[PDB]
Structure 1
């Protein structure tokens, strides 16, 4: 199971790790993807997770969108975890770089509550443009299930831990 995590709260844990390497090591029940509404896994966490699946995540995602249409910002869907996890919970946080409402970040984190344990990145962080310190605060104030956060950037990981209230 999960090793080397710093415990932030009763249910939130954090580690400086590449979520792809972490998923391959742990093979958790659920890995969270930082998805967009179209499930186009081009860059950031999504591009990295999809590349680790040899594009199988994108092929599955395109079939999901062809059948169901796009997700909502703040929404999610459960798909296969491929070689990374049992399932992948694709969660759409607001993309501040697209002018999306940062208030939807709490709705995005609420999706985590449907899973007893998850390996996840900080929603709306990275190329999504939100402040990762704010994302961590919404995470700890919204998620009640056990969430193991992987923060790729060491400098950001240190800043998140050192500034955690």
Structure 2
């Protein structure tokens, strides 16, 4: 996969889909998830409700309502807990949806951490992203330029 990292508002991404780091209940909550809910509109939560509870590590696809993307891929990274193995699974699953749907571009919400070491999380996600096809471009979208630079450094290390 082609891998990018930029500073930005993920709700303004102009590509095929955004990957939303989710709870297994698929309830859109605070922060970025709340931006997606507000800008996208109620239809997103409504489809999430219809899909229902999923397993941690799995992903679910909904429409994106009024957002400038076509889909939101909800990757469930937390539920009734305790995981680095969980981030890997949710990342793998989200990328599988992107392939199945035949997407060319997706953005990840840079929440995936979950009290785990952030550098460790960046590393495991990069590993799964690299296994995705080169027909797919994956953009990590970061709230801060500092967060963006941390992702760039991890891709270098490596």
TM-score, normalised by the number of residues in structure 2: 0.78
1:6 equivalent in structure 2:
none
Give the CA deviation at 1:38. Answer: 0.8
Shift of residue 16 of structure 1? 0.9
Q: Do 1:122 and 1:132's aligned partners in 2 also have CA atoms closer than 8 Å?
A: no
Structure 2 CA distance, aligned partners of 1:129 and 1:45? 18
Instruction: Tell me by how many angstroms 1:99 deviates.
Output: 4.4
Equivalenced residue count is: 144
Partners in 1 of 2:73 and 2:57 — Cα distance? 12
| Mapped contact 2:24–2:78 kept (Cα < 8 A) | no
Please list every run of 5 or more consecutive structure 2 residues that lacks an aligned counterpart in the other structure.
none
2:33 aligned with 1:46 = yes
* Map of 2:122 onto structure 1: 136
Q: Decide whether the 8 Å contact of 2:59 with 2:90 is kept in 1.
A: yes
Distance in 1, Cα, partners of 2:86 & 2:51: 23
Aligned equivalents of 1:134, 1:45: Cα separation in 2 = 22
For 2:91 and 2:142, how far apart are their aligned partners in 1? 16
The alignment's C-alpha RMSD in Å is 2.2
What's the CA shift string for 1:49-89, capped at 9, x where partnerless? 11212333112222221xxxx11111011110212211111
Instruction: Check whether the contact 1:77–1:90 (CA below 8 A) recurs between aligned residues.
Output: yes
Structure 1: gaps (5+ residues): 1-9
In 2, Cα distance between equivalents of 1:54 and 1:94 = 23
- 132 and 56 in structure 1: CA distance in 2 versus 1, 3 angstrom threshold: farther
CA contact under 8 A between 2:17 and 2:70: conserved in structure 1? yes
Asked if structure 2 preserves the Cα contact closer than 8 Å seen for 1:76 and 1:90, the reply is: yes
TM-score, normalised with respect to structure 1: 0.75
